[PDB]
């Protein structure tokens, strides 16, 4: 009926890690190649995603137990979940009023259409928006949102993972924290945890669908040239 | 005492090719990652150079005889001279009054200092400025400036070149055009041609010095990540 001293320490860390790596002002967006509204949004969005990947890496490094993993496993986990963590973290900018990520003014307000001018069809963009709406409607506590990102990241079932025993242990340790936080600190959340886990399944599907659209982009040199080195490397299929 | 019908056709082509690939308004610069004034200028300058490389490729393709070369040779020539063509073409924005490339306002006015915030020392930047001043002082006709770029590009002595017989022929054909244009159309230019050839030698030295500073950048992943795919590929040492 009460969160342990160890469970609250890992929460403090995760919540701080997210504050260190997520800017609510989105002031760094001016440093990206400007948005343009064929495939005009690709450069801006490629920079946005590249920037976010660096942020996700910074966050990951502060996840309790992550640094204790092999460089290989760390990479296998980041490469496989990077896009999912990005999709999760963006919910914080997503707005239900307009069904779009609002990062400031007309420039950094991203609607579903903008992403279609970056090489993605509604065949994939539909589920993503639906996902954001369902995720926003959950009205997650910051503690839960953050815990969800870290649990996503430490998923055992990822291509390339070697020590899927330690990873699952770290993830289980995290799930316990989450299930306990909700039970204790979040009224009416008796059903919440289960809904959050279902969202992880959704992310797998969104991930699969993104990697397919991205594969076409990465295979067209005229488009791939618009990406960044980090994006190409992280979303690339090179094997370590 | 008069330029031939064939010599003037290749001039028309080269001068048009340059007009198609060089914007005096520099209006595309707003689409690059903004300039910042460690290594803050690297992103803007990397985008500038990447953009310029695409332009140089477009120009090259229109050089009489270039398209008739092997894809390999075309690549060997572009990879080896890209930086030299960029250094040549930038003279058109360089200004003696302020000793800097002036592409519009404080933002796109590049001084020697700006480039030092992009990974280059004055140990290399000095000769480059001196080169620009000497080049500007030559007050080249557009026909000569353009001819010089095309002769630089079609230089036989480049690493990777295979058919150095046809290349030299194309270059000789070009040098003749230049020596004849100056003799006929450019008063007091009896010494000009020779001075232009010496500039090509200068470019080799500038090229050598750039590739050394660039090698350090490309070897530091935190810096290399700020480059573009095109830059990395064109200035990279992969062998075809």
């Amino acid at each position: 009926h009460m969160l342990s001293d160890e469970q609250m320490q890992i929460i403090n860390s995760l919540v701080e890690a997210h504050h260190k790596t997520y800017d609510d002002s989105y002031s760094d967006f001016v440093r990206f190649r400007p948005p343009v509204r064929r495939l005009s949004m690709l450069p801006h969005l490629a920079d946005l995603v590249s920037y976010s990947i660096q942020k996700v890496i910074g966050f990951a490094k502060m996840i309790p137990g992550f640094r204790d993993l092999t460089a290989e496993d760390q990479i296998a986990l980041l490469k496989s979940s990077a896009i999912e963590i990005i999709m999760l973290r963006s919910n914080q900018s997503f707005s239900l009023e307009d069904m779009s990520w609002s990062c400031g003014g007309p420039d950094f307000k991203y609607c579903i259409n903008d992403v279609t001018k970056a090489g993605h069809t509604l065949e994939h963009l539909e589920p993503l928006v639906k996902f954001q709406v369902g995720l926003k409607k959950l009205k997650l506590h910051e503690e839960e949102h953050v815990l969800l990102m870290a649990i996503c990241l430490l998923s055992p079932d990822r291509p390339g993972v070697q020590d899927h025993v330690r990873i699952e242990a770290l993830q289980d340790r995290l799930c316990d924290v989450l299930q306990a936080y909700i039970r204790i600190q979040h009224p009416g959340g008796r059903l919440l945890y289960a809904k959050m886990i279902q969202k992880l399944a959704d992310l797998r599907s969104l991930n699969e669908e993104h990697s397919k659209q991205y594969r076409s982009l990465s295979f067209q040199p005229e488009h791939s040239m618009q990406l960044t080195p980090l994006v190409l490397e992280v979303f690339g299929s090179e094997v370590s | 005492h008069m330029l031939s019908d064939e010599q003037m056709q290749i001039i028309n082509s080269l001068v048009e090719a340059h007009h198609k690939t060089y914007d005096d308004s520099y209006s595309d610069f707003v689409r690059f990652r903004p300039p910042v004034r460690r290594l803050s200028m690297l992103p803007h300058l990397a985008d500038l150079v990447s953009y310029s490389i695409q332009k140089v490729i477009g120009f090259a393709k229109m050089i009489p005889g270039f398209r008739d070369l092997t894809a390999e040779d075309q690549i060997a020539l572009l990879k080896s001279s890209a930086i030299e063509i960029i250094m040549l073409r930038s003279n058109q924005s360089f200004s003696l009054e302020d000793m800097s490339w002036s592409c519009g306002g404080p933002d796109f006015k590049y001084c020697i200092n700006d480039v030092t915030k992009a990974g280059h020392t004055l140990e290399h930047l000095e000769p480059l400025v001196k080169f620009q001043v000497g080049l500007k002082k030559l007050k080249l006709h557009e026909e000569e400036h353009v001819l010089l770029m095309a002769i630089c590009l079609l230089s036989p002595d480049r690493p990777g070149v295979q058919d150095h017989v046809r290349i030299e022929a194309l270059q000789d054909r070009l040098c003749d055009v230049l020596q004849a244009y100056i003799r006929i159309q450019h008063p007091g230019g009896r010494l000009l041609y020779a001075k232009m050839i010496q500039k090509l030698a200068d470019l080799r030295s500038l090229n050598e010095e750039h590739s050394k500073q660039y090698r350090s950048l490309s070897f530091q992943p935190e810096h290399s990540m700020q480059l573009t795919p095109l830059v990395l590929e064109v200035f990279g040492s992969e062998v075809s």
Partner: peptide
């Protein structure tokens, strides 16, 4: 070889 990733992972 993931040169950038290794790097960013301190």
């Amino acid at each position: 070889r993931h040169k950038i990733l290794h790097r960013l992972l301190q």
